[PDB]
Amino acid sequence: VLADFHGEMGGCDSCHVSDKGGVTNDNLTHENGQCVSCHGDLKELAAAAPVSPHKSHLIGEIACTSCHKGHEKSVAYCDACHSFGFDMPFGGKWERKFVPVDADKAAQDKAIAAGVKETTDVVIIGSGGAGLAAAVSARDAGAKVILLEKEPIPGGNTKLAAGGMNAAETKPQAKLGIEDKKQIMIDDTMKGGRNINDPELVKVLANNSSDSIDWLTSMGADMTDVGRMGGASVNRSHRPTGGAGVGAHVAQVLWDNAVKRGTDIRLNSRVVRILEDGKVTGVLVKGEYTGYYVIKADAVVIAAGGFAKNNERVSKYDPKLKGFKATNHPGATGDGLDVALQAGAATRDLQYIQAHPTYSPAGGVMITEAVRGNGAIVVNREGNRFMNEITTRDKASAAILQQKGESAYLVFDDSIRKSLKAIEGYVHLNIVKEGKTIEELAKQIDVPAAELAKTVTAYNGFVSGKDAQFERPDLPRELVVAPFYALEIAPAVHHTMGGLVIDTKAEVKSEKTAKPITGLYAAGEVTGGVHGANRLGGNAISDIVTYGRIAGASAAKFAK
Ligand SMILES: Cc1cc2nc3c(=O)[nH]c(=O)nc-3n(C[C@H](O)[C@@H](O)[C@@H](O)COP(=O)(O)OP(=O)(O)OC[C@H]3O[C@@H](n4cnc5c(N)ncnc54)[C@H](O)[C@@H]3O)c2cc1C
Numbered sequence: 001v002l003a004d005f006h007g008e009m010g011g012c013d014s015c016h017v018s019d020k021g022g023v024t025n026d027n028l029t030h031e032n033g034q035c036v037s038c039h040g041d042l043k044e045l046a047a048a049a050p051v052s053p054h055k056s057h058l059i060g061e062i063a064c065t066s067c068h069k070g071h072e073k074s075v076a077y078c079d080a081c082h083s084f085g086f087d088m089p090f091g092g093k094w095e096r097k098f099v100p101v102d103a104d105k106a107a108q109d110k111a112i113a114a115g116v117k118e119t120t121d122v123v124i125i126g127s128g129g130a131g132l133a134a135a136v137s138a139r140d141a142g143a144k145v146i147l148l149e150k151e152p153i154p155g156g157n158t159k160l161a162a163g164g165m166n167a168a169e170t171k172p173q174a175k176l177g178i179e180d181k182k183q184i185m186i187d188d189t190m191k192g193g194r195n196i197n198d199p200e201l202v203k204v205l206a207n208n209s210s211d212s213i214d215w216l217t218s219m220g221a222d223m224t225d226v227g228r229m230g231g232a233s234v235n236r237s238h239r240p241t242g243g244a245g246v247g248a249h250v251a252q253v254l255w256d257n258a259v260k261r262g263t264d265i266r267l268n269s270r271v272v273r274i275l276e277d278g279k280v281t282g283v284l285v286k287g288e289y290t291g292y293y294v295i296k297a298d299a300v301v302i303a304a305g306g307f308a309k310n311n312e313r314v315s316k317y318d319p320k321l322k323g324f325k326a327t328n329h330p331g332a333t334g335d336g337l338d339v340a341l342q343a344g345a346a347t348r349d350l351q352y353i354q355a356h357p358t359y360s361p362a363g364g365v366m367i368t369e370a371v372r373g374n375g376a377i378v379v380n381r382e383g384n385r386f387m388n389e390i391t392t393r394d395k396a397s398a399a400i401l402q403q404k405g406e407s408a409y410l411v412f413d414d415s416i417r418k419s420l421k422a423i424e425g426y427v428h429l430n431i432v433k434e435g436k437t438i439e440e441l442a443k444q445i446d447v448p449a450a451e452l453a454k455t456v457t458a459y460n461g462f463v464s465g466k467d468a469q470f471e472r473p474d475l476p477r478e479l480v481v482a483p484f485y486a487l488e489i490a491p492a493v494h495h496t497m498g499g500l501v502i503d504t505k506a507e508v509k510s511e512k513t514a515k516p517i518t519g520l521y522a523a524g525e526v527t528g529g530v531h532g533a534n535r536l537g538g539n540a541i542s543d544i545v546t547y548g549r550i551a552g553a554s555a556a557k558f559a560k
């Protein structure tokens, strides 16, 4: 393993700050500083390559040591989701074993009394979009902030986002001639979530839309290309120019503005217990390399994201999903909830679990809803349609599940490809089948040519504005410019709509006293209420930025 190959050279000293060994802090800044000093940084190594592991869509600081492990085998972090078969020096298999947030309780207790190490104003749990947005906001005229992330790299699921951040009205919307109104945000969001959404929450998720999309803009962002996500009316899923993805883009812009103000960001740092006055007093952090430690603070923003990804838990509410795959990064396992629950927080809609209908088994990645949005039709194993491709995710997941072999085929054109740049990525991953004709496409896919062609030529007729098969309301493009493409997709656990109970101010309410537990804040996928029982495409990112801002600001007034 790497540190032995380097022990052979000059010592412990090479990397560690001292000759005895040991890490100073959990971000591992010294050591990574030593990596770069003899090997160069990522740009340098990226430039040197001919798909390289040293240059990717990942956002924020990506330590060398997140893959190049000192005292143990090393693994590309890319293998959490892809199977690139990189040949990593000192290689190993990617493996994560979920460990309870409460186990090693003696140790945690032994460690809570054992001093008091640092004190800050406001602690933020997690570095996706809700956590960084809170960082900007707490920090931005207010307090001191210490943000902890347990992964070795930042941005959670936020950074994988593909399809857009919903916004209403006054976004750049003006500029494209897209006519839209606030109440039409609320109203499709109540419709989408089957009318149980907390109405006050959906309201602020409507009424702050525009400013969250202006905020991002005050910061360096690019929210100007707009599309159609399943379930809304007037077009409104904001994204970067020409069909790229908002996630990475938003994460990155929030990471830099968070780092640019004075946030104290720390990776390899899991919050495992909120500190009990019962007013929140601090937090119990297990730094992966520095051990346990207390942070005293006056406000705790919980922004830990969802639990999709923990198949043990998801299978506990909806065992249909047992064994299913997830579209999430490896950190969305429910830690956050557990920490909050321990602190006596109330929750709601924990059982409504969103499965994304078009995940790719072969690539280990979700394939954006925008591919259907821009014109793709979906086809079963027989060669025919079976659904209104822009329906709600739950109905779309269900119909593919009810099909010959449990999977289905996205089929689109050269015209749909051109028009949605996320498609270049799928092409880059080698997961896209290509036909010079539909007959050619059929052979690759193993679906029958006459039947698929008849399907496509009929779908074209529907395209003539009427889908006399399945009612699809929008028929954007015809599907007639060669070459023609296909990808088999299937449903995968994606988002957990439920979670902690919070108000419009981001406060968390106690189960027992049905009022706020003091100084306890929360924002993002870890909360419940915003999406009722079904989340609309593009409402996650809008929820997270709006609600992070509110959670950061609320927490700063607290302590002030
Ligand atoms: C593949 C994919 C595509 C999606 N695309 C879109 C889209 O295009 N538009 C849209 O609106 N929505 C989209 N969604 C939904 C959107 O991504 C939200 O679900 C996601 O942004 C959640 O934001 P968050 O801040 O709550 O959490 P995350 O981004 O998950 O950030 C989470 C931080 O907490 C860290 N953490 C967890 N527990 C602890 C702990 N105990 N201590 C320390 N750190 C901890 C986690 O590792 C995590 O990084 C997408 C989701 C996925 C997975």
Ligand code: HEC
Residues within 6 Å of the ligand: 002, 006, 014, 015, 031, 032, 034, 035, 036, 037, 038, 039, 064, 065, 068, 069, 070, 089
């Ligand atoms: C200078 C004193 C170094 C520091 C600090 C680190 N590394 Fe290193 N590394 C160094 C040398 C001179 C070599 C040898 C080349 C040879 O052919 O013998 C290496 C080797 C590696 C490798 C190579 C595996 C291989 O393909 O042969 C890797 C992946 C590597 N080093 C990574 C690495 C990391 C992650 C470090 C930070 C902890 C780091 N090195 C420190 C010199 C020095």
Ligand code: HEC
Residues within 6 Å of the ligand: 035, 036, 039, 040, 041, 042, 045, 048, 052, 053, 054, 062, 063, 064, 065, 066, 067, 068, 075, 076, 077, 078, 086, 087, 088, 089
């Ligand atoms: C995971 C995404 C990685 C991160 C972050 C870093 N490295 Fe890397 N490194 C990784 C792989 C999978 C490989 C080898 C396989 C391949 O096909 O590239 C490497 C290779 C190296 C090497 C040897 C090759 C070379 O060009 O010298 C070195 C010295 C090295 N890596 C060092 C290094 C440093 C200094 C990093 C921080 C900037 C770093 N790696 C990040 C995987 C990943």
Ligand code: HEC
Residues within 6 Å of the ligand: 051, 052, 053, 054, 055, 056, 057, 058, 076, 077, 078, 079, 080, 081, 082, 160, 161, 162, 245, 328, 329, 330, 365, 366, 367, 368, 422, 424, 425, 426, 428, 429
């Ligand atoms: C799970 C959290 C991932 C990790 C870790 C890495 N990638 Fe990824 N990657 C993931 C998704 C969900 C997507 C598709 C997004 C979309 O627009 O639908 C991707 C995309 C790619 C691509 C193609 C598109 C592009 O932007 O080039 C490549 C080449 C790719 N990913 C490679 C890659 C590497 C080298 C990684 C290690 C640094 C890596 N990914 C991490 C999911 C996840």
Ligand code: HEC
Residues within 6 Å of the ligand: 002, 003, 004, 006, 007, 011, 012, 013, 014, 015, 016, 019, 020, 021, 022, 023, 028, 031, 065, 068, 069, 070, 071, 072, 288, 289
């Ligand atoms: C660079 C290649 C290293 C050398 C030569 C040594 N270590 Fe060492 N160390 C390195 C890294 C990247 C880490 C972080 C975690 C990981 O395993 O990747 C560490 C961490 C440690 C520890 C903590 C143990 C743990 O919980 O994993 C110790 C005790 C430590 N480092 C000591 C140490 C000693 C005594 C060394 C001399 C032989 C030494 N390390 C070499 C990177 C490197």
